[PDB]
Design a protein around this nucleic acid. Structure first.
Lengths: 37, 134, 126, 176
RNA sequence: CAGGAGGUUGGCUUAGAAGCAGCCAUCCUUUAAAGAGUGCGUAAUAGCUCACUGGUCGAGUGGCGCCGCGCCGAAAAUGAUG
């Protein structure tokens, strides 16, 4: 789910990781699988 | 050796369509359809959350009895609890008249955590807020 | 948050007298080993019966309370149970069997004080 | 590695680490070395082992916890070994032991076979269940995942090779 | 890593909230501090993590009133480069 902003965490148990340059958001929920690159 | 599971019925009603089906039928039980039995003990006591030692032996001993309902409910029920149909906002003449609160919060205070000497001075803080009157 | 309060009151609830002990009992939901812990108002009367300040917080707060430094339970969990708050004369026998006749290693105790010195852990249970 | 520093009790095997490349602790059959970095020179000591840092720069305190916990797990496995266990559900299809590699019946229509590395550890004591053991830990996990990589997930329905402590979900399909 | 003391057991709905179905509730006992009980949920429950802790352990860990420098947002048409 590549949005270029709106990487604001919404599932209340997600958390944000930077890795190899990109920004990923990982919850325990496959609906929210954001990455902004 | 038969283990017990903690439950609670509805309060006031007797029907056990789902209550006496898969709920208890899952762990272990016997015979069901206790309209006859739950009206024999539900009607004489309870509008106020009634919890009795739920035993699942073989439905041989008639239930009926009736344990003294717990604290907040058996203080706060006889106002009507009339609202709730629309939205939650402690309305519908939810005024209870504190003297009536004392005569519902009255002799029936036997079984609680180690004491309650008077439930119309300190337990009313739980009762009135949980009902809606702040 | 806590800085001037807490201790200034948990040590006051521990220093009503000098006949405390230690305690720990832990795993279930709240009211029926509040049977044992709150029917320390039955075997006693509303005592700070493990009112549970902390340890290391109570351990360098009890210098300010000056209760002889009963530092035995720097090991496995310390309550610093102040059984002297209502009646510390016979409540130890009622508090030992409350955790003894239950699930395995229910209520472990640590140190104890016999109102003038520190009582031993091997003689506190017996 | 901690908020402070930690002792590393050592038994059975010894140490050494004179080459500098990687320090070592092998037990009865253990010769598992570790490729540890340059300086952060570890100290050879008595029956307990500790570790250093020259400062609190976010290079040295980054290497610090890895430098401890990459020796602290090397000292443990060479005397008993690690293990990882592997459950497998299904409607009647199991693994067997034709040689020392292992077959499976999933939809190649008879055979699925995969070969283990030098840490060979096939052992079946049931009917379909299997577990992997050995000396290492970084290569136990990838072999116990290469076994998983054949018919790995299960989405709608209870099937599939699993792990042991996973509560893996379900959701209905047509009706239910 | 070890632990979550049940009067917290609905008010409509009780076919079912017992925080963890659809609605605010902003109390008390007592102790490992409290869960006015944040999440996974089905028929409620069952249980698990810490959003609390004592244990364990011991000294640099959670946000910013602001700046200095950087990162993704950034796709062409004969072979490339400041």
């Amino acid at each position: 789910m590549k949005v270029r902003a709106s990487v604001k965490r919404i599932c209340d148990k997600c958390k944000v990781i930077r890795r190899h340059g990109r920004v990923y958001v990982i919850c325990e929920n496959p609906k929210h699988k954001q990455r902004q690159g | 050796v038969v283990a017990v599971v903690k439950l609670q019925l509805p309060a006031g009603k007797a029907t056990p369509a789902p209550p006496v089906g898969p709920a208890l039928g899952q762990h272990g039980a016997n015979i069901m359809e206790f309209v006859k039995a739950f009206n024999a003990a539900t009607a004489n006591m309870g509008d106020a959350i009634v919890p009795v030692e739920i035993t699942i032996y073989a439905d041989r001993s008639f239930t009926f009895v009736t344990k003294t309902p717990p604290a907040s409910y058996l203080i706060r029920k006889a106002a009507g609890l009339e609202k709730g149909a629309h939205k939650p906002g402690r309305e519908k003449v939810g005024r209870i008249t504190w003297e009536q609160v004392l005569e519902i919060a009255k002799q029936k205070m036997p079984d609680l955590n180690t004491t309650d000497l008077e439930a119309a001075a300190r337990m009313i803080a739980g009762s009135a807020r949980s009902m809606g009157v702040e | 948050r806590n800085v001037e309060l807490l201790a200034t009151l948990k040590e006051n609830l521990e220093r009503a007298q000098g006949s405390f002990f230690l305690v720990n009992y832990q795993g279930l939901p709240a009211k029926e080993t509040h049977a044992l812990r709150q029917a320390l108002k039955q075997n006693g009367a509303r005592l700070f019966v493990a009112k549970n300040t902390l340890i290391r917080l109570a351990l360098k707060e009890l210098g300010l309370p000056e209760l002889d430094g009963l530092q035995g339970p720097s090991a496995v969990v310390f309550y610093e149970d102040p059984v002297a708050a209502a009646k510390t004369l016979v409540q130890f026998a009622k508090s030992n069997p409350k955790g003894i006749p239950q699930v395995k290693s229910g209520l472990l105790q640590g140190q104890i004080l016999t109102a003038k010195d520190v009582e031993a852990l091997a003689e506190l249970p017996t | 590695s901690r908020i402070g520093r930690l002792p590393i009790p050592v038994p059975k095997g010894v140490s050494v680490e004179v080459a500098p490349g990687r320090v070592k602790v092998k037990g009865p059959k253990g010769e598992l070395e570790v490729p540890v970095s340059p300086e952060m020179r570890v100290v050879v000591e008595e029956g307990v082992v500790r570790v250093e840092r020259p400062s609190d720069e976010r290079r040295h305190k980054s290497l610090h916890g890895l430098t401890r916990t990459l020796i602290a797990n090397a000292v443990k496995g060479v005397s008993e070994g690690y293990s990882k266990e592997l459950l497998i559900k299904g409607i009647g299809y199991r693994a067997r032991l034709v040689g020392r590699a292992l077959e499976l019946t999933v939809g190649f229509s008879h055979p699925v076979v995969v070969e283990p590395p030098e840490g060979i550890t096939f052992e079946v004591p049931e009917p379909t269940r299997v577990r992997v053991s050995g000396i290492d830990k970084q290569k136990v996990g990838q072999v116990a995942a290469n076994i998983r990589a054949i018919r790995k997930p299960s989405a709608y329905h209870e099937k599939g090779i699993y792990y042991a402590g996973e509560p893996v979900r379900l959701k209905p399909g047509k009706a239910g």
